[PDB]
Amino acid sequence: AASLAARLDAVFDQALRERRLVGAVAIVARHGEILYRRAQGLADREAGRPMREDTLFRLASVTKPIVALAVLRLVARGELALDAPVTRWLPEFRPRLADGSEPLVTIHHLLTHTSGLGYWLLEGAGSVYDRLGISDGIDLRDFDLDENLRRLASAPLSFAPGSGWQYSLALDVLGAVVERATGQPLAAAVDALVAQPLGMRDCGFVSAEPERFAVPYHDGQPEPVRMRDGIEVPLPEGHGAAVRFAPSRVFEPGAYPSGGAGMYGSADDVLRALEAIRANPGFLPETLADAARRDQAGVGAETRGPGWGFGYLSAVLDDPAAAGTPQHAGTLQWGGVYGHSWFVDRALGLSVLLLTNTAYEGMSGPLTIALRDAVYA
Amino acid sequence: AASLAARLDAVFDQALRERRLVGAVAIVARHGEILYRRAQGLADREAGRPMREDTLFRLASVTKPIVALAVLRLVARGELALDAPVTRWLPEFRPRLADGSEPLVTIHHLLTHTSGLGYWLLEGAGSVYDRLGISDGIDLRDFDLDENLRRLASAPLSFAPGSGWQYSLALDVLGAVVERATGQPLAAAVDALVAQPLGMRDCGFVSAEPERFAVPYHDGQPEPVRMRDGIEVPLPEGHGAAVRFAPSRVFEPGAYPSGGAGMYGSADDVLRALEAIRANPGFLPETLADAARRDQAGVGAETRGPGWGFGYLSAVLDDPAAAGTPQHAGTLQWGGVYGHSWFVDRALGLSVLLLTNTAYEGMSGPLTIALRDAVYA
């Protein structure tokens, strides 16, 4: 605890001084024990509001494992089935292949990102998704979830369901599926199925408390830049084209619930979901819990580069060596474009969480590599 | 912030190490800027649940300034009046002097604790209050507020109203008064008059969320001991006889709302109340706010020993030298038998709060001195 904290703070002091990071919250738990839980830097640089351990964050893709858990909870009760056609819940979500034909898309294809769906960010401006007006869920658009899905459904699949892997809007699709199966709006379903059962009281999709949030910043010279609605931020090499951010999205009741990018939460709440995933204290049947954490795509998917497969909740480490990491085989990992990164090294009983207000340093920048290496020292 | 945090943390580490404290949440603000907001130790030692910044605490007498503010808000609106007799609202509340007569008891008399009323703790078992079965509001009893007050009023006053000072059930009496003036139960009234306007969202009288609380322990060697309903714990020298604790009281819907001892709240909520008192940004009319923070009793009252008077919300430091404290004249201070202590050193713009689960170390043990001295270090 003291030796680990020494290394992590050294990384944090350097990134803060180097104006590469505005503020963050990082927690390291081992077998349920908190070894590190510290707020760093600032939440709102202009107001001079220091970051706090329970400051709220726009989760972006950190929303995925939480929403994925809700899907699995419904599967466990038989309200959903891994092999069931998505059309049972979304009668009109019938995307076609490039040749015009209509394939079967199961709950399984969606949770694994093997359905053939994609994201606007994969190609950006001028692409098919850009022409059809498909949103990735991080911006604020004047239309609902059903509209976005209709636009999405009209884009051709990149490949046949199950024949490949591609990061996509599948979790946003599953969000609509959850609403149908549950009869409740997504926030209420997630609360009932995951949040409440796990004691996550500080999360949701729409907040009325801006004073509690970490104001989003993006990488910049000679210091990160405070985000505003509409800012398109180019993604790093091999990460896609760009992301259009809408920091006010979280306070707008009219922003449709994004199952792949629209929740907010505190670091303690996210940790709760990750610990549930890690230790499965009777939260899900064991076989389903094992399948969800196992690689369901193949190392060939290279989800975070070589050595990484993908399950029902995130990337799964199949090959530490090919991935160039000290993490053990079976490690679960993913992040969020707002500047977040997390991983559960199952063998070590470790849950490592990094939530930040600096996109993309806190997601893929050197910061993430230095913190990971410091935890392994 | 950094140096203060280091000093405060050293004090806390030593207390935890020596097993004089199970867990606590302390906040230090100066002129509205949070300098220290830190959770320490465990909320539930036996379950290994750590203390969190938002952990809920049974406030004991930290309830008084909050209820006092409610009373004061009604005064500001002309619903209550400082010199109005308590009988205008509680016709039957007619306590008598040892002489047999019914002296006037005003709102001012009650707020200041100069009405002549007392507490069972003043003398404990055998006493007059014991004979009449009067409750101090920390224990769980099978009768309502009106019955406790009917028992209270049947006791003779210790002195003529305004003739002296003595800690009492006056805020409990005021609690009833507030219910009459507003036509609402105490919890709703407080929420309407204080909690809602100050953004206090995690306070109240009855809670149904036990998992959010700090579990009550009492001082002990080797370590503090977890309390159960009905146990009696002797107060330290000069603080009265003892207190009968009922940790389940906060969860019982039939527990009468105690104006002097019955609320729960997070540390943030309490800071919101202390700050409103300290800075009064349009919460109460200036003259009333000044009166409330001004000594209305005299140094002679020695409310917290020599050098201390009392206003309408807490003790008011009149003589730092006599009180043997580094705190500046004009300082407001009070505590709670569950193990709490707070103070507002007005001259320095300081609001210092300590909420703990260890009775009475957190209220009056060395911990309180060591933290006070570290602040002014």
Curated annotation (Swiss-Prot), chains A, B:
Q: How does activity depend on temperature?
A: Optimum temperature is 43 degrees Celsius.
Stored SUPFAM superfamilies: beta-lactamase/transpeptidase-like (SSF56601)
* UniProt-reported outcome of changing residue 61 to A: Complete loss of esterase activity
Compartments where located: Cytoplasm
The kind of enzyme this is, by top-level EC class, is: hydrolase
User: Keywords of this protein's UniProt record, alphabetized?
Assistant: Cytoplasm, Hydrolase
Main localization is cytoplasm
Q: How does changing the pH alter activity?
A: Optimum pH is 7.0.
The protein's Enzyme Commission number? 3.1.1.-
Disulfide-bonded cysteine pairs: these are none
Single GO MF annotation: hydrolase activity
Quote the PROSITE patterns the UniProt record gives: BETA_LACTAMASE_A
The record places the active site at 61
Explain what switches its activity on or off, per the activity regulation comment: Strongly inhibited by eserin, NaF, HgCl2, SDS and Triton X-100.
GO cellular component terms listed in the entry, alphabetical order? cytoplasm
The entry sums up its family as follows:
Belongs to the class-A beta-lactamase family.
What is the annotated role of this protein in its UniProt record? Acts on short-chain (C4-C6) fatty acid esters and triglycerides, including tertiary alcohol esters. Activity on p-nitrophenyl esters is generally higher than on o-nitrophenyl esters. Lacks beta-lactamase activity; it hydrolyzes the ester bond of cephalosporin substrates but there is no opening of the beta-lactam ring observed.
Q: What is this protein called?
A: Esterase EstB
Organism the protein comes from: Burkholderia gladioli (Pseudomonas marginata)
Q: Which gene encodes it?
A: estB
